[PDB]
Structures are given as structure tokens and as C-alpha cells.
Amino acid sequence: TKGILGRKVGMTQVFTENGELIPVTVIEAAQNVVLQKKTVETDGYEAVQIGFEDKRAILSNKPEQGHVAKANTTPKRFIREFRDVNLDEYEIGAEVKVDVFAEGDIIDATGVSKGKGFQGVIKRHGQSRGPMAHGSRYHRRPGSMGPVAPNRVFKNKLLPGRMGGEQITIQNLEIVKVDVEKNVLLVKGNVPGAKKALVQIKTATK
Amino acid sequence: RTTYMAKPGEVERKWYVIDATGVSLGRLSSEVASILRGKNKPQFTPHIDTGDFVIIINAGKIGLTGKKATDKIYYRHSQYPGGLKSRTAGEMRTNNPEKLLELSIKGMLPKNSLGRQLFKKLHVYGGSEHEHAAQQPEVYEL
Amino acid sequence: IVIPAGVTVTLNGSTATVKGPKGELVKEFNPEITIKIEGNEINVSRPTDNKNHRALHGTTRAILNNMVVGVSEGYEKKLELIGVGYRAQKQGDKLVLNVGYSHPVEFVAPKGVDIEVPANTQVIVKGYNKEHVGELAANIRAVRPPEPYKGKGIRYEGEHVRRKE
Amino acid sequence: MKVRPSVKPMCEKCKVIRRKGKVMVICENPKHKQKQ
RNA sequence: UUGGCACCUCGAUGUCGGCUCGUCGCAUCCUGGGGCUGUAGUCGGUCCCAAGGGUUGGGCUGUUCGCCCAUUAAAGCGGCAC
RNA sequence: GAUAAACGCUGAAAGCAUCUAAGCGUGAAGCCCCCCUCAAGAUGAGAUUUCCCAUUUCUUCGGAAAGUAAGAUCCCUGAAA
Ligand SMILES: CCC[C@@H]1C[C@@H](C(=O)N[C@@H]([C@H]2O[C@H](SC)[C@H](O)[C@@H](O)[C@H]2O)[C@@H](C)O)N(C)C1
Ligand SMILES: [Mg+2]
Ligand SMILES: [Mg+2]
Ligand SMILES: [Mg+2]
Ligand SMILES: [Mg+2]
Ligand SMILES: [Mg+2]
Ligand SMILES: [Mg+2]
Ligand SMILES: [Mg+2]
Ligand SMILES: [Mg+2]
Ligand SMILES: [Mg+2]
Ligand SMILES: [Mg+2]
Ligand SMILES: [Mg+2]
Ligand SMILES: [Mg+2]
Ligand SMILES: [Zn+2]
CATH class of the missing domain: 3.90.930.12 (Ribosomal protein L6)
Structure with a gap:
């Protein structure tokens, strides 16, 4: 199981050798370093901690500087753990390049979905509108809060509230191209998040 | 008038270690509840906590008579519609015995703020080893 | 129960081990049911007379017989x-x-x-x-x-x- | 299988037994299988 | 369900159908497992286990219901102030 | 992985027979996992890595207050929020 951290650059399309045209997400994954290895003896579980993008000194504090000094590297914007990896691979301070993947590798992409702010039940939960005419005064409303008997509302009556900005995993995206000199992965289809969003690419759990 | 009342930290609370191997789940629990509550001390004061600390070891070997291992069901409700989960006493004695004994003893403690303090004095271990050697626990017989 | 030649029926507490030519067996019986070893012959001892014991008796006999004949001809x-x-x-x-x-x-x-x-x-x-x-x-x-x-x-x-x- | 509160021999070959605290009759004739 | 009674509510407990939102039971409509068959096969019948998910769009009528058209793996039956 | 109905193996009680009493196996879209998300206010408040260090004057006493460290905020430019 291999893993890397990249930024979503954007979407485009590529023609396959076949001739088919496929949509791709461009993930730029430069400056991934191995910062720490967690073992069962020390931490209670196997994981490798990867630091992604380089960050100006004045944006880092002394606690951060002390943690990346152990891996002889500069402060890092994003630090994430990968579990289910082989710790025998990964030396502390080693770069992690996008060539840990190959064209045809099936990956899971994890990121935070775009923020839509306060949203109603129609957009947030795909509920149906009431009629728009025939005397209706019920358009974009949540529906009955429930029956009478329990003198209260059950605990998953879906209602308006803040919509996106959740963690999302898309499973089984094909890697379409790996460009090491550009530190670029091309992934078939889309991954969560706005442009410039952290994307965690790891080998498909399935 | 003149009846004695224990003050907090007046009565010496002792540490006891009790082997659960073979004893009916209740029977163990009912005796332990009395020790936690302090019902075995003449200084017993209903509002204070004069009881002792209890370590139970070998909770995995606790006794369940009849078909209780398969037929005694422990229920939890999440408070979500249809959120009732169930476990057999048997499965719980195999995988989470610390939980089994805590459920059994919690039910036999007073249902109040002091009852919740008494529960904090109970330490259950599936096996034979605890990490409370510093507290110099004394073996207790039922 | 008769033991044939080559068969060595031993008893370690409640569990019996029966090593023979064809192979070797280990079967744990109920304690209270006690089984007597001899140079050629085996007899099972039913202590008390309760539904439980009446049954176990016939079983401990049957299984031991099966075990022994099991390592003999097969x-x-x-x-x-x-x-x-x-x-x-x-x-x-x-x-x-x-x-x-x-x-x-x-x-x-x-x-x-x-x-x-x-x-x-x-x-x-x-x-x-x-x-x-x-x-x-x-x-x-x-x-x-x-x-x-x-x-x-x-x-x-x-x-x-x-x-x- | 016939599942019914009244379980009883349907021919001379029918045997009444108990498995797992359930009365049943087993028989050479499969039509006669009954559980209570 | 059709009823019986008149115990709460007449200084008001809004009453049918639909819409929205469901949630629960299982006496299961589909899908899963199985026994018997007057089970050759393909189809079925009947009973047992099973409530995870699923369980259509129209014509007529205020309708519920029902009949009909066309589908569907299936077009379940009930409770929650019908 | 463990089970339901069910099917068995071995097997007495009950010289036979018998899936059951002791003992083994098979066996469902269901149960528990596996998958996705939240989650230590899990007051039972967990763990790992890293950073700062032992200041001053009072307080008989316990403790208090008042400059700071690492770090954070106010304020300001903003949006991917
Ligand atoms: C078969 C009906 C049985 C009776 C119904 C109910 C009643 O009187 N409802 C009032 C209601 O009028 C308005 S609704 C328009 C009010 O807002 C509402 O609160 C309420 O008073 C009216 C419809 O008659 N009674 C308690 C029993
Ligand atoms: Mg937004
Ligand atoms: Mg609609
Ligand atoms: Mg309007
Ligand atoms: Mg209530
Ligand atoms: Mg009267
Ligand atoms: Mg009033
Ligand atoms: Mg049923
Ligand atoms: Mg009309
Ligand atoms: Mg109504
Ligand atoms: Mg047999
Ligand atoms: Mg199995
Ligand atoms: Mg399916
Ligand atoms: Zn018959």
C-alpha cells in the first residue's frame, strides 16, 4: 500500500492510445518527505507520517521546527499519517515521489469537499419541493418533523445547516499518467475539494 | 444529637483484589457493591463514601449459570430510531469481560452522584495482572 | 472393551491417549466418569445413577471402543x-x-x-x-x-x- | 416438513423424538416429517 | 374492521383525501436460505428461517377503496391522534 | 467470523435406532466485522512527536499577584471559508 499528498491543480482531459477521451484531475505532489514512523511498540499502531508542501519559517513555530528537524527537512504545510503501509519502505527524511504509483494503479482519493455554507433540505438532502402552484404555500420546506405520539422529533430529522467541507473518499480512481519531473499524477475523473485543495492519494483498500 | 457521622477522608479506604474465577456474575457483583459502598464498616455513613477500592482479576473466568452465556442479552439504544444493539453475556464475557462486570456492578450501586463516584473505585481485568501494585492491594475472600 | 496387539491405551487425569500402528488419538472425557486400565481389557465406571451419567457411561465406552478399533484395523x-x-x-x-x-x-x-x-x-x-x-x-x-x-x-x-x- | 402443534405418528414407521427441546417425528416416508 | 361502554378533553384535543417527511411491526410482496410436493426439466404449490435493502408511472372518481392501461424483481399488509 | 431454518457426522440415554444428552461439522440479502463519516465533555477527558522552562515581589502558614517563555489573540489585507 503506497500513499502521497498532493494539491488539486484542476481538471482537463487526455486522449487514450485507444482514441477514447477521458476527464482527469491533475494532482501536483512535490515536496512529500517522511517525517515520523509510528510503531506498535511506541504508538500502538503502524503508520508513516508524511509532510507535504514547504512553508516559510515565519509561518512555522518552534514546536513544528523541532519535529521536522528530526527528518532534516523544512517546516511542512500539511502532515498526514498513512496506515496499512510497509514501514520497511520509508526512511525518515526520504522524499516520496509520484512514481510510487504507475499508470493503471487503482487509488482512493481523500479530501475535504467544497464549502457550500448554510443550505436547505432541497440542496443539502435532495428532498422534494412542495407544489409551486395550485394554492401551495409549501415550496422548499423540510416536511413533517414526525408523528404526534412521541411528543418530540426523532434524532435524524434532516434539516437545513452547513453543507460541504466534510472529508470524502472517492474509491477506485485509475492513475492515467505519472510525470516525475513535474511531480504530477493524472487521475481519471474528479476528486473532492476546490482548486489548491489537499488530496491524499493512497492504494485502493479494495 | 450524638450519632457519629464519617467526614470525607476520615475513614481509611483500603485496596482489595478479588479473583472472579468461577463465581456467579451476580454473587461476585452483590458482594463487591457492598465493599464499594462501605456497608461492611461500622463508620458507614450514607452520604459520605467510606468504602474500599476493588480490583477484580480473571473476569474472563466469571461464572454464568444455566443458558445465560447464550440467552442473557445486554441491550444498548443509541437514541436514533431503531438504534437498539444487543450482545449476549457469553460474547461479552469472551471479548469485553471488564464491560460485563462493570454493567453487573453499576446496576447494584446507588443511582446518584455518589453511586457514580463509587463506580470509579472499581477496576476490572479479564486476566490475572493489574498495574495497581503501588496501591499495595490486599487479597479479599467472598 | 478388549485391547488388541500394538495398542498402548494410557490415561492422564481425565484425557485418554491411544497410540497404535495405523495412527494416534487424544480424546478428553468427563472427569466423574472414571475408566480402569488393564494389560488386555478396559472397563468404564459409572459412579452415580442420574440421566447424565447413564448416558455419558455408554458414550465414554462407545468412543473409547471406536478409538481403539480406530488405531487397530481402521x-x-x-x-x-x-x-x-x-x-x-x-x-x-x-x-x-x-x-x-x-x-x-x-x-x-x-x-x-x-x-x-x-x-x-x-x-x-x-x-x-x-x-x-x-x-x-x-x-x-x-x-x-x-x-x-x-x-x-x-x-x-x-x-x-x-x-x- | 410439517410444522404444527399436533405432531403424532402417521404410520407404524414414524418415530417420535426430541431435538433441542422440540418434539418431532422422523420417518422413512419424508411426508411424515413433523416438528412441533 | 363493524360494534358495545361513556372513563379524559365542550373557559375548543381541527375532522376525510392528497402533498412533504418519514419511522416502526412482521402475519414477507421482491430479493437471500431451506423442508415437503400429486417436485422429470422449465414453471409452480405449500410450509419454515429471514425486516438488510427494495417495493412504478398513468386513466376515472374529492375520494379512501376499486376497476382499468402500461410496466416491474416486486408493485406487501399493518401501527404511529385512521 | 459466529448463527437462523435446515442438513449432517460421531454418539449414548434406550445391546437397536436416533443430528444431541457429552462432542464435531456444514449452513442466509439477516447478526458481528470488513467499506465510508463523526468521535477523548470516552469528566473513563487516552496516545505519540516537538517546543518552553523552573523568574520576581509577597504569604508565619497554606497560597496569593505580576512581569514573562513557548505559544496564542486583538487589530488589519482577504477567500478556497
Ligand atoms: C369531528 C370533530 C371533533 C371536534 C373537533 C375539535 C374542534 O372543536 N375543532 C375546532 C377547531 O377550530 C379551529 S381550526 C379551524 C381552531 O384553531 C382549533 O384549535 C379548533 O378549535 C373546529 C374545527 O370545530 N374538537 C375539540 C373535537
Ligand atoms: Mg463556500
Ligand atoms: Mg416530485
Ligand atoms: Mg409561493
Ligand atoms: Mg417522552
Ligand atoms: Mg356510569
Ligand atoms: Mg384551556
Ligand atoms: Mg416470521
Ligand atoms: Mg379527478
Ligand atoms: Mg387522521
Ligand atoms: Mg447416527
Ligand atoms: Mg461457517
Ligand atoms: Mg445484494
Ligand atoms: Zn410415517
């Missing part, structure tokens, strides 16, 4: 494939049956059981542990149990299959 359950294109093959340690399915069905015998196949139309299951022979033989029969209309499928060699139109 146990052979024999199966008989019926139906056009039903054939058994023996390739290594895998009994490969072709019994009318789109896939072939394969069986690896456990530790002590052996599946020799004289003819393609019949199978035989040798072993010392009688229940282990019983189970494997049943598991093989389970693949295509005899059907009532043309009697096709895997039967035991003595089995009496009910027949319909």
Missing part, C-alpha cells in the same frame, strides 16, 4: 458415483469430482484421512478417527446427494435411495 467409508459423465479423479492430495456442475469440485483430506479412488465411478475414505472419516465422506456425498427420479449422484455403497416416477 475405518473405510465407500461412495459410488451414479449418472452419465460422473467421474472422480485423484491428482496429488486433491479428490477432483466431475458431477455435472459447470466447475469441478475438489477435496483435500485432513490430517489422518486418505481418499484412494480404484475406479472413476467409486471413491473410498480410509482413516483411524471414525468421525473424521464420517464427516469427509458426508462432505463428499453433500456435493451431489442421490436424487429420487433416476438415482443419479454420490451415494454410500449400501445406501437405500427412495425412487419416484
